[PDB]
Write a structure and sequence with these properties.
3 domains, about 325 residues, flavoenzyme, Uridine Diphospho-n-acetylenolpyruvylglucosamine Reductase, domain 3, 8 helices, cell wall, binds uridine-diphosphate-2(N-acetylglucosaminyl) butyric acid, oxidoreductase, Uridine Diphospho-n-acetylenolpyruvylglucosamine Reductase, domain 1, monomer, five-stranded antiparallel sheet, binds flavin-adenine dinucleotide
Length: about 325
């Protein structure tokens, strides 16, 4: 049931020597995702700088699956784990946030969104206050077109810099990203390394205000101190997920260690010892009950990921529809 990371590293004898970032086998993905659940990643790699990454992409052959993660705040990992390599870029190497002129910011892809919030305040730049509430990283924001409070990532993105699976650099633009609701059209083999941001200059007392209103909303209406991946499902047109969920009677619904948050019922909470199966079963149990109650088929906003354990597959909607 999944070869160990040892065996992966042993087949890759010598082609990985000369890499400076850490190579950790069999790292649970519960150690690295906000849900605090999931199975083993065969090998975790944490490149030191863009060139450690580029070297590691030139080194690993294409048949081995690669997955890039940031803070793992949008991932539901299954209890069977993730084959191949999992890449989490280094904070020290890819977390820098600096001002370049008077309207623009450059941020490495590992930089937490909240660091880009503070950096814009320290530069008098409006429109970055929505990163103050999103606990993810800038690499996932660019990929998920992350957004809140009526602002999305797409509106502050100037140009993005990435590596492809052959380790060759790509400077891509806001148009190339192909942005939509929680979506980018950029190739999925691309690894974002940094981005150039641009906001309209503004008064700092205002930027504070918006950031304090952003944070007050989070602390008051969302369970953002819990182990969760955030908003489970997209809001259906003309209504909202949490509502259609509460209507189906699902506020507080439990599967094992997983619960639908009684505070905000589009959030799934690991109350301590939830498995990956617990969370995907709750989600698809809610999908099933909301469809039956409203005919609305909910769309996942959290990425499900990895392998089921033997005899532990889950059918979308629990097999009730297809
Ligand atoms: C309390 C809470 C509140 C949230 N609020 C919001 C919100 O308001 N708006 C919102 O949109 N989301 C929200 N989320 C979801 C989550 O924060 C975002 O989806 C975010 O984009 C994920 O960031 P991450 O660092 O956790 O990335 P991960 O979860 O690790 O990965 C998410 C995606 O980003 C990709 N990715 C990450 N880094 C790179 C990279 N360097 N190169 C290429 N691809 C990369 C991964 O491949 C994956 O597809 C919330 C989550 C929580 C737990
Ligand atoms: C968290 C995410 O994005 C969030 C984002 O934080 C906020 C923007 O502030 O609006 C969306 O949530 P949302 O539609 O539930 O808006 P919220 O502000 O969180 O709550 C909506 C309103 O209904 C109230 N509310 C919500 C849930 C509940 O169980 N009870 C309740 O009373 C809240 O008090 C609030 O007044 C995004 N969710 C989706 C599916 O689009 C994410 O993508 O992971």
């Amino acid at each position: 049931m999944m070869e160990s990371g040892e065996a992966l590293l042993k087949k890759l004898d010598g082609r990985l020597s000369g890499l400076r970032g850490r190579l950790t086998p069999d790292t649970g993905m519960d150690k690295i995702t906000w849900f605090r659940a999931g199975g083993p990643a065969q090998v975790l790699f944490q490149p030191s700088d863009e060139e450690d990454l580029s070297a590691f992409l030139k080194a690993v052959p294409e048949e081995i699956p690669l997955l890039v993660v940031g803070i793992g705040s949008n991932l539901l990992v299954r209890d069977g784990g993730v084959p191949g390599f999992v890449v989490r870029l280094s904070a020290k190497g890819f977390g820098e946030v600096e001002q370049v002129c008077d309207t623009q910011l450059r941020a490495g892809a590992a930089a937490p969104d909240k660091r880009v919030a503070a950096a814009a305040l320290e530069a008098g730049l409006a429109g970055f206050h929505f990163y103050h509430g999103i606990p993810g990283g800038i690499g996932g924001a660019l990929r998920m077109n992350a957004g809140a409070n009526g602002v999305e990532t797409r509106e502050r993105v100037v140009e993005v810099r990435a590596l492809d699976r052959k380790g060759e650099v790509h400077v891509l633009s806001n148009a190339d990203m192909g942005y939509a609701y929680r979506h980018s059209s950029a190739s999925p083999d691309l690894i974002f390394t940094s981005v150039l941001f641009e906001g309209v200059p503004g008064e700092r007392d205002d930027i504070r205000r918006a950031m304090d209103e952003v944070q007050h909303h989070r602390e008051t209406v969302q369970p953002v101190r819990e182990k969760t991946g955030g908003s489970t499902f997209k809001n259906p047109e003309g209504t909202s997920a949490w509502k259609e969920i509460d209507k189906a009677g699902c506020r507080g619904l439990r599967v094992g260690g997983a619960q639908m948050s009684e505070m905000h019922c589009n959030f799934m909470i690991n109350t301590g010892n939830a498995t990956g199966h617990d969370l995907e079963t709750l989600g698809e149990t809610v999908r099933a009950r909301v469809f039956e109650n409203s005919g609305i088929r909910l769309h996942w906003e959290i990425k499900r990921l990895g392998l089921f354990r033997e005899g532990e597959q889950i059918e979308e909607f629990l097999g009730k529809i297809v």
